[PDB]
Write a structure and sequence with these properties.
homodimer; alpha/beta; Urease, subunit C, domain 1; TIM Barrel; 2 domains; eight-stranded parallel β-sheet; 28% strand; globular; binds 2-amino-2-deoxy-6-O-phosphono-alpha-D-glucopyranose; binds fe (iii) ion; iron (chains A, B); Metal-dep_hydrolase_composite (chains A, B); protein homodimerization activity (chains A, B); Amidohydro-rel (chains A, B)
């Protein structure tokens, strides 16, 4: 169905239209205007009072949620994340693996390749943009909740095998540069236009600066599983903040880091160099309990997911809720929200021609939210994928 | 002598005049223009080729230099700092005390009061704007090079005595808020328009936020003698960076903190909320050796001043050299330099009506520097106080 969204504040690439209309046809945005379009629309949505139209949010680092985990390596896994992610305003994602035995990683990559290729559920809900390979090529000293017994130095031929198994779907790799001899895998990823994200790394600042020259461009979940900031040895944390060649992922749940630490990331990076993620695992959107994550038991109580030794282990964060917290932490604009939840991700993935802004020609991936970032309605490639309690 | 500076790039409050003239009469700036003034001038200075006219730099945290230390409590002490500070582009300063026996602090404060009052050397060189009382009301856990045996909790009646002894000259106090029961002294300083600078403090973020409400507004030498940044407990370092109610002093020598840490301070604070200082002690501008500082022996080798246990102990930094490093660390503008070396200090001390910008009506405190921040000439309240190797 062609679709028209009526009388809403629209957050475009560069501005906020106070009251506008967006028309959608054959999956794409065909009209963005202050005035009702002439053309007829099959369904029309009358937007609630103080609502805001944002570009659909893009989560580049997310393991699971709603009982599912990428590592499970079934079609059901992705039917579920696909189906349910629109409820937190997410319209596309990178299914994220974890450090694990290489054959477990192979199964997850092949599953995703085949599920996307099936073109069944992969046409509906949040679009599987590909894979974020998180580990195993990380530091034994910054494992966090990555299974320690499966951590191994970078292996370019094994990755090459993984990327063939993935049918080219791997878009980002998280790795520790100091565990990558000669920046071999970093140099390989740069060659292949796969983002090299520095994470779970105990590297010093000098080495990170050299990695950026070899092609590193992202930092994985800023503050988490990183060598700390010392004012005379800034480590991963200080380089991620002060080095303008890195885009920084951030988990804005107010648990992975303090509100002032989230605010510092926004001050230091600016709204064009920061990408909110959930890093969520399978207990997101379920109840208290114990859940598998990377072969370990994670005990979820309240908003905190912990290993038995109290190590934080993924999040329980919904994407829209991250937006709300960042607005509280920094008083940023709706424009900045669109940036740090959608636009920056799209640009970094090289898909800004089709995602990441409310703009004519792009996929009609959109979220209607309240002034408080509650999700009201989500559209995915032109189909309504979620409608909240405010139906009618 | 009335004075005219000819054909120079001038850094005003809000702009850089590419080629201008500044005329000076009876100690004040009387003309700032792109065109040669009509009025006759007794001496005229022809500025060298790529030079820049900056407002004279203001150092709000400096113990000594050139063999002298505030704590020495002689007229010679201030004759020397007064006389010699213009060589690093400094035209006004706060002589800074240290943690020490209360009678040693009394002597330093009375000396300064009497030396300023004498109006002899106090009319020439860098102007003694008053005193920065650094300690003793600091943390035993963040003493750094402050003499540990003299550290004591805040005492409002003893300060009140000190300020009477100082003839009202105390403009800033460095103190640890957690050692100030009920924020009593902080509340007192706010009442008296004396800056309360948080420093040598092991406080957490919550407490610092409450101190700012009680009236705390500065942070003493950002990164040094501070509880570290942890991403979930930001401490003094993270609050100083992310809390917009604090102006942050910074020692830009590339030794007290790493270049990326200096750059982070500039990203997080912006150029209106950061104040370069030297924190220099008596060995500044002398040779390698051992020197007294706060009753301890400081071994100066190269650019590093250390206690016998390797603790950093004041700096050997010249003010203009701090400007040069910050330009290297951040690529900031000449305008930003004027801010972080002069304007912000003046505004914070409540003396922007007379210092801190190249502006008609203000004291003629000015520094001519090269494109690399080498000092060429310094004027103090209208008198030439330093002329380098480029005479003629
Ligand atoms: N998925 C990662 C974990 O692996 C890590 O343990 C956690 C906390 O990291 P940190 O203790 O360094 O802040 O971040 C995320 O939750
Ligand atoms: N005058 C202070 C010292 O008291 C302190 O020891 C030093 C280093 O501080 P830190 O080791 O915390 O960086 O800063 C300045 O030099
Ligand atoms: Fe991780
Ligand atoms: Fe993760
Ligand atoms: Fe100090
Ligand atoms: Fe000091």
């Amino acid at each position: 169905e062609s679709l028209l969204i009526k009388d809403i504040a629209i957050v475009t690439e560069n501005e906020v239209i106070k009251n506008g209309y967006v028309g959608i046809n054959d999956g794409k945005i065909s009209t963005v205007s202050t005035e009702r379009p002439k053309e007829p629309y099959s369904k029309e949505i009358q937007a609630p009072a103080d609502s805001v139209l944002l570009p659909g949010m893009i989560d580049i680092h997310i393991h699971g949620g709603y009982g599912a985990d990428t590592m499970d390596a079934s079609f059901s896994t992705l039917d579920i994340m696909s189906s349910r992610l629109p409820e937190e305003g997410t319209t596309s994602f990178l299914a994220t693996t974890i450090t694990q035995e290489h054959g477990n990683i192979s199964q997850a990559l092949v599953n995703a390749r085949e599920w996307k290729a099936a073109e069944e559920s992969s046409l509906l809900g949040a679009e599987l943009l590909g894979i974020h390979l998180e580990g195993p090529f990380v530091s034994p000293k910054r494992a966090g909740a990555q299974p320690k017994e499966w951590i191994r130095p970078s292996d370019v031929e094994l990755f090459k095998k993984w990327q063939q198994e993935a049918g080219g779907l791997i878009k980002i790799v998280t790795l520790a540069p100091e565990e990558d001899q000669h920046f071999e895998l970093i140099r390989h990823l740069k060659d292949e236009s796969i983002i090299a994200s520095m994470g779970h790394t105990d590297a010093d600042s000098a080495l990170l600066s050299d990695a950026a020259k070899a092609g590193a461009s992202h930092m994985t979940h800023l503050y988490n599983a990183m060598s700390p900031f010392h004012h005379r040895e800034p480590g991963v944390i200080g380089t991620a903040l002060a080095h303008d060649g890195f885009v920084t992922e951030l988990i804005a749940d107010g648990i992975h880091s303090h509100p002032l630490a989230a605010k510092l990331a926004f001050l230091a990076k600016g709204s064009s160099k920061l990408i909110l993620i959930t890093d969520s695992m399978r207990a997101k959107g379920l109840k208290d309990g114990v859940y598998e994550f990377g072969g370990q038991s994670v005990t979820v109580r309240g908003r905190t997911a912990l290993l038995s030794d109290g190590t934080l282990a993924g999040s329980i964060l919904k994407m829209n809720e991250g937006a709300r917290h960042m607005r509280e932490f920094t008083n940023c604009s709706w424009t900045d929200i669109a940036n740090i939840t959608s636009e920056n991700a799209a640009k970094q993935l090289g898909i800004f021609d089709r995602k990441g802004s409310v703009t004519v020609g792009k996929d009609a991936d959109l979220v209607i939210v309240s002034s408080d970032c509650e999700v009201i309605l989500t559209i995915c490639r032109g189909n309504i994928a979620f409608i909240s309690k405010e139906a009618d």
